[PDB]
Symmetry: D2
Subunit: 459 residues, 4 copies
C-alpha cells in the first residue's frame, strides 16, 4: 500500500483498479529477494481506457485557471515531504536505493515540482507582426494534450516527476508507464501524490505491465501527442522508431543518459575535483543529469588525481541500503550480468584495474579502471552501474575529443580554476548542459510540454 491504497493497482479513469491482464508480475526487493507484492498487470484494453479517459478529461484541466493548477501542483510538493519517510522506505525496498540517495531523490522531485508550480503563470503566446493589411497573427501557447511518460528504474520518482509535474502544470493530462522493476516508485507514488493534491480524475494515470504485452502499444497509440522516455539508449531508439512508424507520428522526447564525461583540466583544483568525481560517480549514480561514468584527466595531473580519486572511493561503504551505505544493490539479475560482463571485457580489452570490490548477490562494489582508451567498450557504451573509467588526455584539445567520443545526452562536468577558459572549453563539448566546478531548466520544460498554435485572422 501507499498513502491509502494498495500500490499494486492502476490509476485509470481516476479510479484505482486491478489489472485485467493474464500476467502477474512479482515485485522483488533487489537486496534480499523478498517479494514486495504481486499485481495483475495491465492489458492493452487497460492502456486504452487510460489514454481515452485522459483525452476526455484534459480540456477541462487545461482550461482551469492558472492560479488553481498552480496551487494543486504546489500541493503535490507539500505532499511529497508529508509522505517523505513512506516514500524513502519504498525507494529502499523497490529501487534498491540507499537511505541517503532516497532522501536526495525526494528533495529533487520536490524542487522540480516546486518550480513547475510557477509554470501556469509563465505560459505565453504572442501577437506577431502582420505583413498583410487587415491580418492579425496570434500564436497561442497551449498544452500538447495527452502525454505518455515512460519512467525508468534508476531514480524512479525523480526522473518521472521531471516530466509529470511540468506536463500537468501546463495543462496536459499524463499517463505514466513505469519500468517493470519499479512500478510504484516510478509510477504509483507520483500518480498518487498528484491525485491527493487535487489533479482531477483522468488527468493523472498509471499503467504498469510487461514490456512484450504493452510496451509498443503504449507508444504507437493514437491518443498521446507526446511520448516522454527516460532509460537506456537502445530502448530509446525503439521508442523513437515506434513513434514515427505507424501511429500517427507524435513528438518523442528522449532522455538518454549515456556515458557522461567528467573532464579535469590542467589548472583544476585536483583536490575538490577528486572529491566531486567521487560524488558524481557513485552517490548520484542512476541520476541521468548528475551521474558520470568516466573521468577524463589531463596528463600533467593524471597520476595525482588518479591517486586521490582511488583513495576517495575506497571509503565508499557498500552494503545494506536500509542502513550509512552509499551504494546499494543492482536492480535486476539481468542488470547484474551486464555489469559482470563489462568488468571482464574492460580487463580483456587491456584496461588496468585500480579499485575492485567483491560481488555478493546484487551488491556490486565500486570498480575503477585507469589506462582506458576511447575505443574501449567500457568507455563507449552506457554503463548504469558503479563502474568507472579514467582516460588520459595528453592535451586540453584532446580532452574535448575524448569528451565527445562517447554518446551521452544529459550532462558533462569540467574542473578548472580559470573560469573564463573553462567556459569557452565547455562550449567545445557536445552536451546541452556543462557544469563547471561542482539540473532542471523550466524554460526548456514549458516548451517541451506546450505547442505553439499560429492563428491567422484576416479581417
Amino acid at each position: 500500500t501507499f498513502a491509502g491504497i494498495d500500490a499494486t493497482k492502476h490509476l485509470i479513469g481516476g479510479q484505482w483498479v486491478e489489472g485485467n491482464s493474464d500476467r502477474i508480475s512479482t515485485n522483488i526487493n533487489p537486496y534480499d529477494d523478498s517479494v514486495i507484492a504481486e499485481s495483475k498487470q495491465a492489458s492493452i484494453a487497460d492502456v486504452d481506457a487510460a489514454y481515452e479517459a485522459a483525452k476526455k478529461a484534459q480540456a477541462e484541466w487545461a482550461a482551469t485557471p492558472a492560479a488553481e493548477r498552480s496551487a494543486i501542483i504546489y500541493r503535490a510538493a507539500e505532499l511529497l515531504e508529508e509522505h517523505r519517510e513512506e516514500i524513502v522506505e519504498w525507494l529502499i525496498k523497490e529501487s534498491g536505493s540507499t537511505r541517503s540517495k532516497a532522501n536526495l531523490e525526494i528533495t529533487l522531485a520536490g524542487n522540480i515540482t516546486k518550480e513547475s508550480a510557477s509554470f501556469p503563470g509563465r505560459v505565453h503566446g504572442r501577437i506577431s507582426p502582420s505583413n498583410t493589411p487587415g491580418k492579425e497573427n496570434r500564436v497561442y501557447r497551449v498544452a500538447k494534450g495527452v502525454v505518455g511518460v515512460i519512467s525508468p528504474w534508476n531514480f524512479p520518482l525523480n526522473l518521472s516527476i521531471r516530466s509529470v509535474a511540468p506536463a500537468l502544470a501546463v495543462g496536459n493530462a499524463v499517463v505514466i508507464k513505469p519500468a517493470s522493476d519499479t512500478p510504484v516508485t516510478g509510477g504509483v507514488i507520483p500518480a498518487r501524490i498528484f491525485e491527493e493534491a487535487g489533479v482531477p480524475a483522468g488527468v493523472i494515470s498509471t499503467v504498469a505491465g510487461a514490456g512484450s504485452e504493452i510496451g509498443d502499444h503504449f507508444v504507437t497509440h493514437a491518443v498521446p501527442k507526446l511520448i516522454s522516455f527516460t532509460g537506456s539508449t537502445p530502448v530509446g531508439r525503439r521508442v523513437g522508431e515506434l513513434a514515427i512508424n505507424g501511429g500517427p507520428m507524435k513528438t518523442v522526447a528522449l532522455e538518454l543518459g549515456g556515458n557522461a564525461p567528467f573532464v579535469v583540466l590542467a589548472d583544476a583544483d585536483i583536490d575538490a575535483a577528486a572529491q566531486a568525481a567521487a560524488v558524481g560517480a557513485f552517490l548520484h549514480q542512476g541520476q541521468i543529469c548528475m551521474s558520470i561514468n568516466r573521468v577524463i584527466v589531463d596528463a600533467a595531473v593524471h597520476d595525482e588525481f588518479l591517486e586521490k580519486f582511488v583513495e576517495a572511493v575506497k571509503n565508499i561503504p557498500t552494503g545494506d541500503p536500509s542502513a550509512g551505505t552509499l551504494v546499494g544493490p543492482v536492480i535486476n539479475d539481468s542488470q547484474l550480468s551486464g555489469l559482470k560482463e563489462k568488468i571482464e571485457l574492460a580487463k580483456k580489452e587491456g584496461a588496468t584495474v585500480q579499485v575492485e570490490g567483491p560481488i555478493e548477490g546484487r551488491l556490486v562494489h565500486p570498480h575503477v579502471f585507469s589506462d582506458v582508451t576511447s575505443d574501449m567498450e567500457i568507455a563507449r557504451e552506457e554503463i548504469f552501474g558503479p563502474l568507472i573509467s579514467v582516460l588520459k588526455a595528453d592535451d586540453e584539445a584532446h580532452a574535448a575529443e575524448l569528451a565527445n567520443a562517447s554518446d551521452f545526452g544529459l550532462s558533462a562536468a569540467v574542473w578548472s580554476k580559470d573560469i573564463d577558459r573553462a567556459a569557452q572549453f565547455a562550449l567545445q563539448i557536445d552536451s546541452g548542459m556543462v557544469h563547471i566546478n561542482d539540473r532542471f531548466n523550466g524554460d526548456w520544460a514549458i516548451e517541451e510540454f506546450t505547442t505553439d498554435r499560429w492563428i491567422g485572422i484576416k479581417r
Copy 2:
C-alpha cells in the same frame, strides 16, 4: 545546360563546382514534353562525404562572422533572387513543370523568406538564468547547430529549399543540399548558387545531387550533420526519421504537407470561400503551407458551396505551363501520374461522386473534384500531390472539428466564418500548427529550429 553562367550539371562541394563521381548518369526530363534538359553525372557516396567534411571545417568561422556581416550576405541573396528572376522562372517551368505565374509566385515567396531571414543574425540571443545554488551563475548560450543537411522536394523546389537553407545559413549554420532527383537545379543548384553569389564563404553552402536510396541514406545517416531538414512525402519522411534513429542520431525536422483541410462553417461568405478554395486547391498546389486537399462544409450550406465551387474550378486553364494564362501544369513524372490515376479510380470504388473531371493527356492532369466523401476514405486521409479535391459534408459544428483532425499530417488549415471571434475559438480546436481564418513563414520558429541551446553553469 546552364544557370547564372555556371554549368547546371555540377555539384557545389568544398566551395568548388565539380562534376559528380558516381558512374550513374541521371537525365533531367522536362515533365511537359519529355525533352531532356541536361544529363549530369551523379554524386557518389565519397562526394557526399567531401561535402559534409568541407562544410564542417568552414562552419565555425562562418558562425564567428559578425551578425551584421552575415545579415548583409543574406539580404544580398534576396536581391539576387530578384535580379535572376527571369532566368529562374524558365528553369521552374522547364524542370519542375511549374506554371509561369506559379513560378513568379514561388520566387516572390523565396525572396520574401530570405529577406525575413536576413534579420535573424541580430535576433539570436541566449539567456542568463537565475541560480539556486550560492555563487553559481547560469548562462545558456544560443548557438548554431553546426552542419545542417537539407533535403528539398520537387513541388516548390526553390521556395521550399530556401525555407530551410536561408534561415539555417543566416543563423550560423553551414548547409548541404540534397534536392529531389527530379529538380536538382531548381531545388539545389539555384539555391546554392544564389547564396554563393551573395558571398557566403566556400564550404558553407553546398549541393550534392545523387541517385535516390543509397546516397539518400548515406546523406541522412552521416556523422557530420546535427540536423536533417526534410520536406516531402510522409513515407519518405518516415524513412528519414527511421534512419536518423538507427544507422548516430541527430535531430530531424519533417515538413510533411499531408492532407490539409479547408473548413467552411454555416456563417461563412460562401462566394469568397468558394473562390478561396479554388485558389488554395489548384493555383497553390505543391506549396505545403498554402495548399488544401479537402473541403469540409456545413450541411446548411453544402449545396450552395459545392455548386459555387464546382463552377469556379471549371474555369481554370489547364495546359502548357509556358503560357501566361495557365494555372495547372503537368505532374512531375510518370510514377506520380500513376498515383494520381489510381487515387481517382479508388475514390470511385470507395463510393465518392465525381463533381469535376477532365482528360489527362501526357502528365497533364485536369482538375478533379469529388463530393460525398467520408473521413475514412483515402482520398481525404492520405497525401495527394496533384489537382484532386474532396468535399465532405459536416452535419454539425463540432462534427467539422472531427473531420478536420481526421487526417495524419498537416502544416496549415483554413476556416471560413463571418463570426471572427467564434472562428478563432474554432481554429484552436484544430490540431494544426497553422490555421488561417478568412483569407506563411514563422521567423521565430525557424530560429529555434536552427539553433541549439547550451546551458553552462559556473561556480
Copy 3:
C-alpha cells in the same frame, strides 16, 4: 499592536524602534474620531538610518538563492492569510475600510504576493549577438538596489504590497513611507508580515512621518535608486519633479488612478454593465486598477442604462464599517471630506443633474450620482477619490472613444459591448495601459519595473580567447 510588535513603532535597521522627531502623530478612526493610537514620528535622521541600513543589507539579499527568496515571499502570502482577522479589524479601524472590503483587500494582497513568489526564478538576462569579432555581449538583469515605496490611504495594504512584494522578491531592499492617515495598514503590517516570513534585517523597513519634515527628503535621498508612488496626481507630479532635480540619479514609477472611464457601447449587455458599474464605482473605489470615476454611454442605450444603474446604486448599504453588509464607509479625514462636499456643489453650479444623493453624516458620504455631464465639468475631468459618479452621454461609438480619452489618467478602463471582436478593436483606441471588456496585476511588467539591465560588453584578445 499587530502580531507581537506595537503598531506605533517604525522598522529601521531590522528593529522596531520609537520615532525621533519631536512631532507627535495621533491616529484617528475616520468613523468616530477615536485615538487609535498616538506615536512619535520618524525624523529626517530616521530616514537616513533606514536607507543606509537597507543599502548595506541589500546585496546579500540579492545574492540569496532564487528558490530561497521565493519561499520567503510565498510564506508572507500565508502569514497574510493567517493574520486575516487581525488585519481586517485594522483596515476597518484605521483606513476606515469596510468589513467585506477589507477582506477583499487581503485576498488581493495575497494573490499579488503568491504571484510575486514566482518572480525570483523568472528574472533572467540575455546574451546578445555580436557585431565586432571576438566581442561577447552579456546583459544582466539585476535588482535596482534600494527602493523607497510611498503607499496611499486608499487600499493601503493592497497598494503597498503591489510594489513591496515584487520589489523584495526580485532582490531589492525596500523602505516604506506610508500615508500619514494609515501608518500601520500602509506600512507596519506589510513590513512586519514580511519580517515574520523571513526577509533579513534592513531589507524591509517602514519609516512613518509627517510629509512636512520627511516627505521631500525621502524622495530626494541619495540611496534609493527607485521611488514608487501611489496617490493623487498633484502629489505624484511633485514626487516626479523632486526626483529629477535632487539626488541626480533615480527613476520613478508613478501609479496615479485619476478618472478611469467605464464605457458602455451601443451593443452592451446593459443589465450586466449596470451591476458591474455599480461594483466598480463603490465597492472598489480607492482601488487604483479596478474602480471607475465616470461612465460614458451610447445615446441609444443611455437612458435605459441610467435607470437601471441608479436602481442598483440606490440599494447599496451605506453605514457602519464594522457591519458585514456595508459596502461604503467613511472618508479617511476631514480634508478629504470637505474636498468632496466642494465637488458635489461644483458639479451642481455647472449645470449637472443629480440622480442619486444621500446625507453626509460624520465623514460618512452616501453615494452621489450625476448624469447630464460633459467632458469639461471638473467632475468629469479631475480625479475624485470618493463615492461620486458622473454619467456622460455619447453620440456614437466614435464619440465614446473621445470621451474616454478626455482624461489624463490612463491606468485602466472598462468597456461593455456584446461584440467581442469589435470591442477589442475599440479598446485599442483608449489611452490606458489596460482595458477590460465585459469585466488584474501584471507580473511581467512588475519584474521589469523593479530590476535594471546592465549591458557588459567583453572584448577578448587572441591571448584569452581559446580554441579559435
Copy 4:
C-alpha cells in the same frame, strides 16, 4: 542646400517651408567664422503645426505593413551612403567635425537605421495567462504615437538618427528639434533622408527655433507621447521637469570613466584612452573624460598615454583628428575649466595651444574626486588621470559622477573584470574594448486588453 531641397527650410506637414518667427539665425562655420547660411526661425505656431500634422498622419503609418515599413527604413540606409560625401561636408563645415570623424558618423548612422530596419518584424505582443474562468488577456505592443526628438550638436547626425530611425520603423511619427548650432546636420539631413526613403507626409518633421521661444513649448505640448532628449545634464533636467503628461527619455552624457585595473595591459589600454578621449569626442557612448588607474601601473600608464595624446595631430584635412569647438560659449567653458583645474592643484601633464576655436588636447594628473575637472561634464578635450589606491577605490572613483551612459574597464582577468564591471552603475560597461531590443521598448507601449467572454 541639401540633396536638392532648400537647407534653410523646415519640413512641416510634409512640405519644406520657411519659418514664421521674426528671428533669423546665421549658421556659422565654427572653424573659420564663415557664414554657411541664414534661416527664418520656427515659431510656436510652427511647432504646433508640425505636431498636429504628425498626429493625423501617424495611425496610417503604424498600420502600414511591417515588411513595408522595413523596406522604407532600409532604403534610408542606402540613401545615407549615397549622399555620403555631401553629408561629410556638412558635418565638416557645420558641426566642425574632422573628415575622418564625419565619415565615421555616417557609417554609424547607417548601422543604426539598418539595425532599425529589422524592428518592424521584431515587435511582438503577448497572450498572457488567465486566472479568471473564461477570460483572455492580450497585450498588444503598439507605437507610442508622436515622438518629439531633441538632437544635439555633438555627433548631430548619429545621435539624431539613433532615436529617429527606431521610432519611425516601429510606426511612430517624429518631429525633430535640433540644437541651435547644428540645425541641418542634426535636423534637416535626417528628416530629408527619410523623406526620400519613403516616409509619408507628416511622419517625419524638423523644426529649428530659438531656445527661448520654442524650447519649452516643444516639450510641454499635448501631442507628443514621448520626448527623446540628448544633451548636457542640466538642460536634460528642465526637460524632464517640464514633461511633468508624457514620458521622457534622457540620454544625458556626463563624465564616462575609463578604469584601468592593476593587471590591465597598461600599453594597449593607454592607446585606447587616447582614442576614447579625442577620436570619439562628440560620441556620448564611446567617449571618456577621465581615467582612474591603480597606483601600481599609474605612472606606467601615464607615460605611454601622454606620448599617445602628444602624437594626435591637429578639420577639412585628412590627417587631422581633432576639430574646433561648436561656439564661443563652449570655448570659454573649457578655458574656464582648464584654469580652475590648475588653481585646484592638478598637474598639467599635457597642454596644447588654443588657436581660435580649436582647443588642443589637455591632460591633467594628480587629480582627486572632489574637483570639477573630474566631476562636471566636460564636452571638450580635457582629460583627468586619477590614481586609485586599490580596486575598491576604483569602484568609488568610477561611480563618483552623477551621469554615465557607458564606462570602460581594462584588465586581463576577463572574469574579475566582468565582476568589477557590475559594481559600476552604468547601462554599459566595456572590457578591453546601440541596443535594438531596448530601442524597440523605448518607442512602443504595451496595452493590456482583458476580455471576459
